[PDB]
Ligand binder design. Structure first.
Ligand SMILES: CCCCCCCC/C=C\CCCCCCCC(=O)O[C@@H](COC(=O)CCCCCCCCCCCCCCC)COP(=O)([O-])OCC[N+](C)(C)C
Ligand SMILES: CCCCCCCC/C=C\CCCCCCCC(=O)O[C@@H](COC(=O)CCCCCCCCCCCCCCC)COP(=O)([O-])OCC[N+](C)(C)C
Ligand SMILES: CCCCCCCC/C=C\CCCCCCCC(=O)O[C@@H](COC(=O)CCCCCCCCCCCCCCC)COP(=O)([O-])OCC[N+](C)(C)C
Ligand SMILES: CCCCCCCC/C=C\CCCCCCCC(=O)O[C@@H](COC(=O)CCCCCCCCCCCCCCC)COP(=O)([O-])OCC[N+](C)(C)C
Ligand SMILES: CCCCCCCC/C=C\CCCCCCCC(=O)O[C@@H](COC(=O)CCCCCCCCCCCCCCC)COP(=O)([O-])OCC[N+](C)(C)C
Ligand SMILES: CCCCCCCC/C=C\CCCCCCCC(=O)O[C@@H](COC(=O)CCCCCCCCCCCCCCC)COP(=O)([O-])OCC[N+](C)(C)C
Ligand SMILES: CC(C)CCC[C@@H](C)[C@H]1CC[C@H]2[C@@H]3CC=C4C[C@@H](OC(=O)CCC(=O)O)CC[C@]4(C)[C@H]3CC[C@]12C
Ligand SMILES: CC(C)CCC[C@@H](C)[C@H]1CC[C@H]2[C@@H]3CC=C4C[C@@H](OC(=O)CCC(=O)O)CC[C@]4(C)[C@H]3CC[C@]12C
Ligand SMILES: CC(C)CCC[C@@H](C)[C@H]1CC[C@H]2[C@@H]3CC=C4C[C@@H](OC(=O)CCC(=O)O)CC[C@]4(C)[C@H]3CC[C@]12C
Ligand SMILES: CC(C)CCC[C@@H](C)[C@H]1CC[C@H]2[C@@H]3CC=C4C[C@@H](OC(=O)CCC(=O)O)CC[C@]4(C)[C@H]3CC[C@]12C
Ligand SMILES: CC(C)CCC[C@@H](C)[C@H]1CC[C@H]2[C@@H]3CC=C4C[C@@H](OC(=O)CCC(=O)O)CC[C@]4(C)[C@H]3CC[C@]12C
Ligand SMILES: CC(C)CCC[C@@H](C)[C@H]1CC[C@H]2[C@@H]3CC=C4C[C@@H](OC(=O)CCC(=O)O)CC[C@]4(C)[C@H]3CC[C@]12C
Lengths: 592, 592
């Protein structure tokens, strides 16, 4: 795709260099070739390359100081020229010699007054999975990322703005957090903060947001950058006293905790795809904050909601047990017809006092289903299940009003969805909590991958079992009497939850005993135990990280409860200042 | 709670320091600020802080020697002042400068005659989970715990009592055992014992009990402090001879073995919550003592009690097999009534010689149940089971006398509790012993955690299965005919111990085949194998430490048998002295 086009422009770049004697002598720094071409005609001194590059760009790429100096003496207006293509738009040779860390050639270009504010907006510089570097857009950003302490100072002396932002809004401090070598990126962060002696007014530059709204501290939390997180936390950390081995430590807790309705650090870490962002939860001020919110306010409000939900589902269950049924009016159509009862009409469903007790429970059920929709729809997996529950309750309400047959099908969905939603409240308990993570990763992991191989063995053998018994009498062996039942029976024989079809009083077809023996080996022995071996591996992986997974469950529940409860009902965690003379900020004390 | 109040008093402390110029200059040692405030008015020289602290307390906290000396020259009566709050009651600055290890400021306070006997009874010093340090109450105790060898000597030279006890009764030697850095605590133990040259009469101070009764040696065993246990065992260890690589070693065995009716080291280690106390059992004199008690006296007396219990339960079983039954008098009420026999009245239960043989076995059963209560009630898990057994035997005795119907329900409990109590005697065998620890940790571990998720899937699907078949004829498919049976059937279908409901001669409801397929996947495949994967992990953890767990089972059995058998029947283990001229102490010889 774009990779194929980037491959072709890279080969087109090397061709145009070989086609041009100037670009070739710029690549391989033959001084005698460059001297002859310039003492001749212009020879395309402003030659536009394949990448939009010039000759002075080329000597910058290939680390050719002696070539680049002769090209600057030849034409000094090339120093200001930007590279002109979609890949490398607005890139100067000052950008290139910075990235190549060519110390003598950056000093030479700054002597010829190369711009330090030149923005490199080409798509090879944008933050994308296709690019292997994200350095920003400015030369100061590029030198900060290749860890060149000598070049960042020279750019600042020549007037590079430390406050310059790229198209994503990131300053140079944001970009350093996005870098793979974190320990070098810490030291460059400390260097660039030291040059914010002026301009700390109107923003201190460690507090600038990007276009997502993130400061460098919140970006370190969101990106899973734990090394930069601990280093940024030192600024927000205050030592209160030291009593030998003890230390009382006061944490700032402003951007960490939900200071406003805008998403804080706890919500952004839960609502992100990055697995390594969850490593911020066992960092020190974040870990005791989550535990404090849960024990004081999270777990009491959650256990109340689980108790109310459990009483409500018991109420819904009893209305389904006592659903209005009467003896059937019509006669039995076939001997296969097994139905004895049918559901009452609306006019006769409510005529006794026991029907009035059920009516109260049915209204409590319907009112609860509306409140589930009013909480959840005006906006997870249990998110979908409780909406699917409340939808099924309203469907059976509509069928009750218009007297529609088949209320058993919305109720049966609603019974199993209503009671399996109680497993949501297992996360109030630490031992019970990651059990449902095991169930999710066994369903949407092991089952969804291996059901396709199971379904095709079931389809093969049920089709074989169907045609083997297609000529036989079903009254003796009716497991495969029609093709939907044959398919359901083979699924049950797969799971060994029904017995193998046997009638010793008749002769079964010869082909059955061979096919069922082949089925018993591949399906019940091999593939069934293969799946169980997978799910035991899922169990082992989730139980290994179960404390970390439970803590991530607690934050998501705390973020959700704080979002839905009133602010009077959820007090802010920690200790506010300003009655102790600390400002209006809410602090958290940790004694270690 | 108290943590929130401790957080607030810590912030209130820092405010009152900032409110006071004296306390602020005491915190940050500005000598010019302290000089001006004292050459002015008193300026609250006896200013009471938030923690009950004074200015001289503050210079002690923040390691301000130059501040504290000026404050002592200003008012020397502050040197004697205690900190006055619930957190830090009776704390002096001599306490603080000791903990901060400020060597020049402890010498200055002792020059101004600061008390070495001052007790710090505040709740921040008490042994509690809320506190991170337990240092005791005296300055000598505090210097011993921060490992300051130079300060403990200076306190002793000024008259600090090495025999001072805190509110828990602990001397300084007890407190050192309770310290996290054991290797430093060994060296401080050796230092403080050297200053017991005088006063070894009336107690040698390594033999002082605390209020629980524990000496430092027994506290090292109870607290799991194996490093201090081995070091204390050197004093109780006597080398008898050395024959090249051999060494005959005589162990004192006084506090280890049950010298009196007061609890010894073996009973205290079993009857404690700490898992690391069980690490004392594989230390040298304790390990060969337990093996000696078991092989000589433990295992023969235990195998006799297990043989007698096995013969007794066989006697109880045969009386239940032969329980008095007669043909039923009334007629069959419904076709669902299956009962053919009923239990006899008392007057006809004993009329044949075979009824007389059973009467002897029933009295042997009743006498055994009374003896179980007389041994166990005038005081574990098998502790509860054998009492629950003997209660069920007396309940069926009462029902036999008053001719109450339903003796089958107390007997059935008594049959399964009586025979499962034979698994108690599996610990007489090392290979069989930790099997019952696996069963306990699979029941009260894996089952009690995961039954709640299982129960709610059973409740959801049994309710669905009940309403699906609520309109059908039960004679064809009666698994779910009423709601208790539907719930029991779904439990059995969960465990795959009954087959899936099928009748191929009728049409089952459409909703059944979908719901049972959903049930077969989530319950029989996924959640059932999830539990088995857990219990296999419990099996793997218990089988890894199975020798250590079996040895802990042997001590508990030995402690229980010694407590219940007469002293003539349980001889003291090891070799008494005084016929070999060693004193009256009982020794144990170990050749290594
Ligand atoms: C745990 C304890 C449960 C014990 C197990 C259940 C057994 C219980 C006995 C009788 O049958 C005759 C009629 O039966 C019926 O018709 C009852 C059908 C509806 C019952 C709901 C009552 C409404 C009260 C609404 C209450 C608010 C619902 C809660 C909302 C938060
Ligand atoms: C994850 C789930 C995967 C799917 C699992 C299983 C799917 C099951 C889902 C639904 C089935 C249940 C719905 C009932 C509908 C009734 C119609 C019927 O099927 O039978 C009809 C026949 O027609 C057929 O036999 C069609 C089946 C042929 C091939 C099936 C492959 C389709 C799925 C491919 C997916 C591949 C994916 C696998 C991997 C790529 C009529 O029944 P009869 O009694 O035979 O009448 C014949 C009358 N006669 C006597 C004259 C002869
Ligand atoms: C996962 C792998 C396991 C697969 C299991 C087996 C592999 C399959 C390989 C091959 C199967 C070959 C099919 C036979 C074709 C001829 C049909 C015929 O003549 O039927 C005749 C029988 O005649 C016979 O008995 C056939 C001779 C023995 C074949 C079966 C033995 C398989 C042993 C395998 C050894 C282990 C190999 C695997 C080791 C692991 C007549 O039948 P009838 O008795 O009169 O009944 C009448 C009913 N009917 C007419 C209505 C129909
Ligand atoms: C191992 C060997 C067992 C063999 C297996 C059992 C088979 C054995 C044969 C006959 O039926 C006719 C009457 O049957 C009865 O009525 C017997 C009911 C009570 C039997 C108990 C005898 C009491 C002796 C009390 C003895 C003290 C009890 C022990 C206390 C320490
Ligand atoms: C670890 C163990 C956990 C519990 C597991 C299972 C508990 C099982 C324990 C005991 C059950 C067995 C005792 C028999 C008593 C008979 C009464 C009866 O139940 O049926 C009665 C109906 O009334 C009901 O249907 C009540 C049930 C509704 C909801 C059940 C939830 C209660 C437990 C919540 C705990 C949640 C904990 C889970 C996680 C939070 C009558 O029967 P019927 O035939 O239907 O009559 C209807 C007549 N009709 C035809 C007119 C319609
Ligand atoms: C753990 C997850 C597994 C869940 C398993 C299944 C998921 C459930 C999802 C959805 C179930 C939807 C319910 C149907 C609602 C309409 C009712 C209806 O019209 O009935 C009609 C049939 O009409 C049909 O046949 C319906 C069309 C097919 C639905 C069933 C195929 C499910 C395939 C799923 C593919 C794999 C998906 C999952 C892959 C893993 C009439 O019924 P009847 O035949 O005439 O019988 C009469 C008896 N009765 C009137 C007394 C009642
Ligand atoms: C007539 C009255 C008494 C009915 C009783 C009402 C309650 C039983 C209902 C009404 C609203 C419900 C709540 C609506 C929203 C949610 C969020 C929901 O969150 C998720 O499932 C999202 C997280 C995830 O997907 O895992 C969990 C259930 C809960 C607390 C519900 C619990 C049960 C509640 C309190
Ligand atoms: C009437 C019949 C046909 C209904 C079919 C039942 C299934 C569609 C239901 C019943 C139980 C449900 C499951 C119950 C519990 C979970 C675990 C749940 O896991 C989590 O949410 C992870 C934990 C976390 O979010 O912290 C994801 C949904 C899932 C698999 C549910 C998916 C839908 C299931 C399989
Ligand atoms: C678990 C496995 C890997 C170990 C070896 C077992 C199978 C390879 C063997 C054991 C029993 C054998 C079966 C025993 C009896 C028969 C019946 C025989 O056909 C008959 O005579 C049946 C009567 C009829 O056709 O009606 C065909 C072979 C078959 C299925 C045999 C096929 C091969 C089987 C399954
Ligand atoms: C008519 C006569 C012959 C009846 C026979 C009497 C014995 C069969 C009974 C009487 C007292 C019983 C003992 C009473 C107390 C105990 C302690 C009990 O200890 C525990 O279960 C506690 C440890 C734990 O909980 O694991 C184990 C069974 C045992 C030895 C009992 C074994 C069976 C004994 C010897
Ligand atoms: C008539 C029916 C309804 C009675 C129900 C039977 C259960 C209540 C009983 C039968 C077997 C019993 C179990 C048999 C063995 C053990 C192992 C036992 O493990 C230990 O004591 C650990 C070993 C040790 O102490 O060294 C704890 C009790 C437990 C789980 C028992 C708990 C109670 C159980 C499950
Ligand atoms: C083990 C799993 C993860 C792998 C794939 C198996 C299931 C996804 C498939 C295999 C067989 C299928 C069943 C085959 C037959 C039927 C009957 C069909 O309804 C009927 O026509 C039955 C007749 C009646 O309603 O009375 C409804 C779908 C269902 C349950 C199918 C649902 C999906 C099943 C369970």
């Amino acid at each position: 795709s774009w990779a194929q086009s980037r491959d072709e422009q890279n080969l087109l770049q090397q061709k145009r260099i070989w086609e041009s004697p100037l670009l070739l002598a710029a690549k391989d720094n033959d001084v005698q070739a460059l001297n002859k071409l310039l003492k001749y005609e212009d020879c395309k001194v402003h030659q536009r390359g394949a990448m939009g590059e010039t000759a002075l760009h080329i000597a910058a790429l290939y680390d050719n100081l002696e070539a680049a100096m002769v090209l600057m003496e030849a034409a000094p207006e090339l120093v200001f020229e930007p590279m002109t293509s979609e890949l490398y738009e607005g890139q100067t040779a000052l950008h290139i010699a910075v990235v190549n860390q060519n110390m003598n050639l950056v000093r030479a270009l700054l002597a010829r007054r190369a711009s330090v504010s030149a923005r490199a907006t080409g798509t090879a510089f944008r933050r994308s999975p296709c690019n292997l570097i994200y350095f920003g857009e400015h030369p100061l950003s590029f030198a900060a990322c290749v860890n060149s302490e000598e070049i960042v100072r020279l750019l600042i002396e020549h007037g590079a703005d430390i406050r310059a932002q790229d198209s994503l809004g990131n300053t140079v401090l944001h970009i350093l957090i996005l870098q793979p070598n974190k320990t070098f990126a810490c030291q460059m962060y400390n260097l660039l903060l030291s040059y914010d002696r002026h301009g700390d007014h109107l923003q201190p530059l460690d507090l600038v947001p990007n276009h997502q709204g993130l400061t460098p501290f919140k970006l370190a939390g969101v990106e899973g950058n734990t090394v930069m997180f601990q280093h940024l936390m030192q600024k927000r950390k205050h030592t209160q006293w030291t009593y030998g081995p003890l230390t009382s430590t006061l944490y700032d807790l402003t951007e960490i905790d939900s200071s406003g309705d805008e998403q804080s650090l706890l919500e952004l870490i839960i609502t992100t795809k990055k697995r390594e962002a969850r490593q911020i939860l066992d960092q020190t001020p974040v870990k005791e904050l989550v535990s404090l919110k849960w024990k004081r306010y999270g777990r009491p409000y959650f256990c109340m909601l689980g108790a109310i939900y459990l009483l409500y589902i018991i109420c819904f269950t009893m209305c389904c047990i006592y659903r209005p049924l009467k003896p059937r009016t019509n006669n039995r159509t076939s001997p296969r017809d097994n139905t004895l009862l049918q559901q009452k009409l609306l006019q006769e469903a409510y005529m006794t006092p026991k029907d009035d007790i059920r009516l109260v429970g049915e209204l409590v059920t319907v009112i609860g289903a509306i409140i589930i929709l009013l909480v959840e729809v005006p906006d997870g997996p249990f998110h979908v299940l409780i909406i699917t529950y409340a939808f099924m309750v309203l469907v059976t309400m509509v069928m009750r009003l218009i007297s529609a047959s088949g209320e058993v099908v919305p109720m049966s969905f609603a019974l199993v969805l209503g009671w399996c939603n109680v497993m949501y409240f297992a996360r109030g308990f630490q031992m019970l909590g990651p059990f449902t993570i095991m169930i999710q990763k066994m369903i949407f992991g092991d089952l969804m991958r291996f059901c396709w191989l199971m379904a095709v063995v079931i389809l093969g053998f049920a089709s074989a079992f169907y045609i083997i018994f297609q000529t036989e009498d079903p009254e003796e062996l009716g497991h495969f009497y029609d093709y939907p039942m044959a398919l359901f029976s083979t699924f049950e024989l797969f799971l060994t939850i029904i017995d193998g079809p046997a009638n010793y009083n008749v002769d079964l077809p010869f082909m059955y005993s061979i096919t069922y023996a082949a089925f018993a080996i591949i399906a019940t022995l091999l593939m069934l135990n293969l799946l169980i071996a997978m799910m035991g591996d899922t169990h082992w992986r989730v139980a290994h990280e179960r404390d970390e997974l439970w803590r991530a469950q607690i934050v998501a529940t705390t973020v959700m409860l704080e979002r839905k409860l009133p602010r009077c009902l959820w007090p802010r965690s920690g200790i506010c200042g300003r009655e102790y003379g600390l400002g209006d900020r809410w602090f958290l004390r940790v004694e270690d």
